[PDB]
Symmetry: D2
Subunit: 474 residues, 4 copies
Amino acid sequence: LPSPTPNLEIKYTKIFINNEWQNSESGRVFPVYNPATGEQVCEVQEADKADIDKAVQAARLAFSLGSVWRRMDASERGRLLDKLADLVERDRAVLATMESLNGGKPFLQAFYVDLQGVIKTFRYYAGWADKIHGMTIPVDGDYFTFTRHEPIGVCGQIIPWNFPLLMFAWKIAPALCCGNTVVIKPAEQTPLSALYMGALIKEAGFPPGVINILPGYGPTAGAAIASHIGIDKIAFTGSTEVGKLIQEAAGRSNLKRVTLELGGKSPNIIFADADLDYAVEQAHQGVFFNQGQCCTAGSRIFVEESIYEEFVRRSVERAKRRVVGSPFDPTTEQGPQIDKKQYNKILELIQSGVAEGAKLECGGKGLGRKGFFIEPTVFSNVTDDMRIAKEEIFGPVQEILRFKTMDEVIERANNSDFGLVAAVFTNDINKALTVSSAMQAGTVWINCYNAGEFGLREYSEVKTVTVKIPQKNS
Amino acid sequence: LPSPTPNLEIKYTKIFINNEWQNSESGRVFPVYNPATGEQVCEVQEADKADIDKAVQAARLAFSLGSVWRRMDASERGRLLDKLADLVERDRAVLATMESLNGGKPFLQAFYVDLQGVIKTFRYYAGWADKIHGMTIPVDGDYFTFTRHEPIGVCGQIIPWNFPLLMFAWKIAPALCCGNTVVIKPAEQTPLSALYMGALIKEAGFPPGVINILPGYGPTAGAAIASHIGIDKIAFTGSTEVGKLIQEAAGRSNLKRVTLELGGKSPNIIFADADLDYAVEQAHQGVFFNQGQCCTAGSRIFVEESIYEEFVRRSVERAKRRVVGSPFDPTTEQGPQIDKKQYNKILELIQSGVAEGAKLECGGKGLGRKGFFIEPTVFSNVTDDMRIAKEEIFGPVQEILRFKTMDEVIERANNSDFGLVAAVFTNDINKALTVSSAMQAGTVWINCYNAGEFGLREYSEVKTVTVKIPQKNS
Amino acid sequence: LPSPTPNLEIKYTKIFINNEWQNSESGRVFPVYNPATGEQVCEVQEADKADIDKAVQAARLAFSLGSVWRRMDASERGRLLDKLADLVERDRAVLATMESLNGGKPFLQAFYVDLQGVIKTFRYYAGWADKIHGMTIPVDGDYFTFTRHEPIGVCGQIIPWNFPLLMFAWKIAPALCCGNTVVIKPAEQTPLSALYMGALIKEAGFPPGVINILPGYGPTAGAAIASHIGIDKIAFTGSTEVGKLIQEAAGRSNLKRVTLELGGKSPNIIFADADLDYAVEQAHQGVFFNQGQCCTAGSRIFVEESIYEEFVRRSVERAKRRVVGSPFDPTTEQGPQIDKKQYNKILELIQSGVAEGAKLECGGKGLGRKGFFIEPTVFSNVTDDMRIAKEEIFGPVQEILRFKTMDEVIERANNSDFGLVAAVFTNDINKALTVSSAMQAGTVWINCYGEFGLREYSEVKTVTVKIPQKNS
Amino acid sequence: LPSPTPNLEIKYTKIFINNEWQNSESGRVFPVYNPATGEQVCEVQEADKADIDKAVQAARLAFSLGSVWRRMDASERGRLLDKLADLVERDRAVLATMESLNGGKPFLQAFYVDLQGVIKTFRYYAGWADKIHGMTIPVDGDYFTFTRHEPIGVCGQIIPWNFPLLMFAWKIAPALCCGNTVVIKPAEQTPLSALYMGALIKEAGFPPGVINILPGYGPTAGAAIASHIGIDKIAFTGSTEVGKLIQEAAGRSNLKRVTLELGGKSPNIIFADADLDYAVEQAHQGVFFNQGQCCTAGSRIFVEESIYEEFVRRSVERAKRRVVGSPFDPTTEQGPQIDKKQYNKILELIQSGVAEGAKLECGGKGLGRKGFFIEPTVFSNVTDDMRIAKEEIFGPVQEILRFKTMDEVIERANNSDFGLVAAVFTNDINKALTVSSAMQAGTVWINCYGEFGLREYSEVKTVTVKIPQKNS
């Protein structure tokens, strides 16, 4: 068992541009709080349009033809990525601590889950860097045609606050493995580990201007990036509200390519032939992981009538024994919520559903006086048209619905806006096959949930060369 | 030898939805004209926001789960693409006539290039519908993970007038071969070729609603497809301004996937080593093929100062010799411009040149009254400053710019700020190597020009499926 | 329903070189029989080493650099293969009739599975011909490396007699797809289907010498190409024995590329949660389809202890009811065995098993004379030690073994020295999971009975260009 | 500049089986010489059939189903491969020195060329291990088909002495990356860099049995491998003579998969338009690198007539100023050849071409009295008839030919039996284009001298699941 970093000093708090730590152009600065105690952890250089323009200029310069980063061998990009999964490794405890501190998630999970995933990621695109292959194509006539992949250029990426450092690797690592330069805004709530990565980037020795980290707010720094004239790709993750704005601010900007990963509903189909103890434990980790603040995990759980009663009973025993406490105490399964705005929105929703005929089985009220702690709450007899069902609840709220027929539960889970991931627990292989093909989802988990190379195409563009040849042959 | 269809009737002028020819929901029609004779050729059922909805409902029910088009073997998706290639090949004389009248391209050229592209396209992608493979990924843990490539769904497509039937085949075939359903709006200028395809689609026996043709205007039918909420992806070719509009129309409603084929300059660098007989020719056909209406060809021609006067000589000779005249005269090389508004913006830009310093060496005015015929024109002594070299001309104008060194050209050619294509004519291998990698082009052509798999990647969606397995074993 | 061709003149009997029908350099011919009647159906030119030469030279000049078939667009090669499927779709009845009379499969099966397969193979491979893609690779330094997939060249193919026409198509589509050239020799038992193809191959119009059909014998002509100095690859399918000689015959001759398709056991595993209606029949059509003679199925059946006797019950009920007769009878499910040597080696083994403690549940002997018809037999209570469960039975013999636990049924299946396909029947997703991994099986079919054939007909060419300065 | 390890103690002289160092079962021993001086460096435990059967049981066991190496995550096999390049990097100077001493490579050459490549190779497949992907295939009907690539199993690998370590890296990394186990036999000349790698392989912590290293001889250890019954795939590299033997010694023995990396002819083609100062040197380094001892020593240099004289004039000056010396002296470009057999094989071939009309412009005899050094030789006026031009040299002899036209030289150059590799030196892009295609080569370089290494250590397992109703 590892131990949290004692008396942690937030060394790194300035803006990261051209591998220099720089003050804000205004001098302005904003505070970062501790969701467990509501206290303030420190203050960091806010970034605005002026501050963004700096970072863009740096990242364009580091992308120019004669540049170190541009001239490097692909395998030497994979080396640098691999050196940073080394530095992440030796500092695993501090990056897991500063996650625990900034982000309220239990320090043991932040170590064995989050940081773990940051390192494997970096290692994995480390290996991809020099295995990104174009093709050669037979073309009617005396021609030879072939295809290079090449970096797109300056990418600005905006990440939410659910998984601050994991989002960070998830986005840096493909971007760099393809040879791009980067301008990343971590959420305003959780910039801290992001900034610590900046020193680790200098330390593994990426060329300057290749990774630039600007902490600050959606309206200021975020909107700066989303509309900047000198950024080629923007990749954003968060609320479908703010997502809409990015896409329009990008066709009225420079037509920059745009990636949007937005939340979705995550239905959770449990047929009766499943191991009830397994499923009650998986569906409880599938809703209660990272205190429900999991953009990859959901809350709509469809239990088959046969096992509906017993399931609820099992799940409510799980929540009632589910330790909520200080993130740094190693027996805590569930930390606070990220901030008060989130805390309120979930309560307002719990009391919403309690006022539409949902049987509150437990929870449904805050925990402490200080912090943002919410009792793990379970709801029963949720109908499709309850508000609580139509809108995903980004906290520790388990909503158990009922179903009796397979095609029923399929059309129900199916109906949905854009965005949807599905999870089924069955042993009938025919049941798994029909359902997983029928779900209009992009990810489907047969008997599990979790938090690759398709991520690479979306950081490169295809250049096509065709040469005329004297006499074509087989 | 092949001769235009005589007494050609325009049998197909209604709206194509659900494999029924249909009238406007408003009763209204719109004119279509013969750019050669200026004469109105017929009148077509104009489409608007409600016609669009008709075809979106068609195209959403035919993509539904039980659907014939969904159950179909992917191998049979390709059989229909081959049966349609059959029909096109059968009616290759009628199609090339229709394209030549309503579009203005010479008939022989519509028969031996355009139409040859159409048929080759459908046979190509008939071969792909079988071969769209997903992948199996090894993952850490006791898990089995694979991907499926599944159709995106209802695809609104908006093609222009440059190559009416070709652009129709280049957009429709990849989306079909991936299992999609289409709402395609052909140019208001040139919709007769695409309406006649509906009749061949019915005869090949696509399930109704799997393709729907809606002729109309950009502002009515164009934007109607762009904002319509039951269209999962939109694919547009044409003006850079219209496309920025679409990207906003698409963020504001539905957040659809959006694809913008948008024009640009196409620098031609003809280094001195080249074979001048070939280069004067390949650079003359690159400019005047399809009378200048080419978003897959260019107007800037860069010649090394060594061979400048000899080049502008041989160029003006070929442009003096170049044969204008009716599309059906089998001696015509260049036909008319598509309609008056273009014909006028081309002469506008010719007079722009003469009043800024261009050495007009040939042509520069209209030919007569009949139709929209413009003389073949060659400019000279052009700089990058001039407004004829900073904005592209969509007509039969050949401008020729000077250069001296090679790193000189590589800079001047990249200066669009946006995405283009390049061409290079060299016997030296390292020039060819150097310039082709130095270009910011989507495609480079070495010792040629021209008017695959990678169009396919944009017409399906990846689904992932991780199964929990009872033990991992290599 | 479709009907066999009434007047089946076997027009095509000569050897095929350079798209010319030719006679034996020796003049010698050989017989071709009808296993339904034991009657003799015609006499076909017998091929030997001197016929294999000329044939190898045909293909050699058809593949030489400045050639039509070489300079061709790959897409045209696609068009050619695609035209072939047309003619086979046209003469479907003809070629199902000729396949039924000569090889003895029921003509309805010939028309609806074999010919189904052939036509689809040529179409699938018409579609590959022009999508065979190479590779640009990032390489340290100022360089630029790419890859071309290029044909191998002259390819000797040696196909068996189980699915004569299908096997002919499975072996020729990919090779010609990649732009190879073929000297194929079909089983002496069944040259007839293949010599017809030669007509259509010309009618569609492949360049002369791009395909070359060779009728004759394994030792006479099969070794002629197996050891032939001017052949680049050899493509054998047959017994585990005859291939070992091919593999050695190569190492001593040319260092040809050698692929060997060799028959192996197909164990079925029917756990007791399986649909017994489906299982007893799907494992009855895996054992008895094509009169047992299957290089894509097998005879060992492992049924769970709980569902054991009820299985073999429903199975003997299916094998008694299984109609046997003339292949042209729209009722016949099983036709004859391929020849008398085959006939005997079957009955020899069915007498082997009765003599070893295997309850002969059904069948066991012949049917009548003038033809090679064996009763559908069923064995129960077959151990692993019995010589009929150790050795392949190439006939209508369904032996059923017992098993009590899953790790037990998985240990018995894998026990086989060479290749193997396995077929599982279970609704337990996790049982399916473990069995299909644990099998050391090439193919695994859960609840039933492409490109990786393309990569065998091409070699890789790699070109690195030195460049002036490298940039992303 | 780095400095060779001083007074290197060859510490690792024993067989490597099961991550334990063992003596030979017979207890026999063989010696290892220094090709620069001819003095024996040390002795090594000789491996034979007895030893190979320990090796093959240890690796078959490492491959068993519940083994560490099999339940390991793919990405972990890549982690292991990454520690091994780490350790090679840590020991770059001892491995380079072992190589310089055992194999006679100039020490800086081992250090910046060979060891660079060992390390990069291990790093590169270290990234491949968990990116080895299968397929999901659309299939006619209510079905779901997909592909998983899986290790073949125990692979016995045999390597030459040209590039002892480099050939070890290149052979083992792709094998390991796919999750196999190995039985590798270094050349008897040059086991030493290999046997050290056993210590490194134990260090990084590969499970036992996954890598067993047997030093000894072709007829004993190597033959005991190719024929073994417990080996699933034989991977040989060297003379096409022993090559042929191993393909036959693997027909007569479990029909195991064979891979043969045998020498071949490597023509150079210098067109007049090229940069003569580049071309003369890249052609010089193409011949004399590693003392002519390349897998395909680029022996034939066709030079277009217009530059022919001036090319050979500058060539002879380059060969005359080439420093043949002690491998440990940092000014050395050319070392000794591997042993006397190779040595006088070369002297006899030089005496051949002199006796047939080739104008020996420099070189032709040995160097000192001790060791196996040979003057860098260069021949003029060589013709395709001469034996030295028809048969491959494995040493420092450059043979320069004339040519007139492009199609002449193209026709001349791919006039090889089997293998060929080609290099063109030209600025004419069309010439480069036509030559590189019309070359019957497998690798073609323009203006100079991976995953196509993976599929070969996997096999595709196919699974087809029946589904209730397929939608797209």
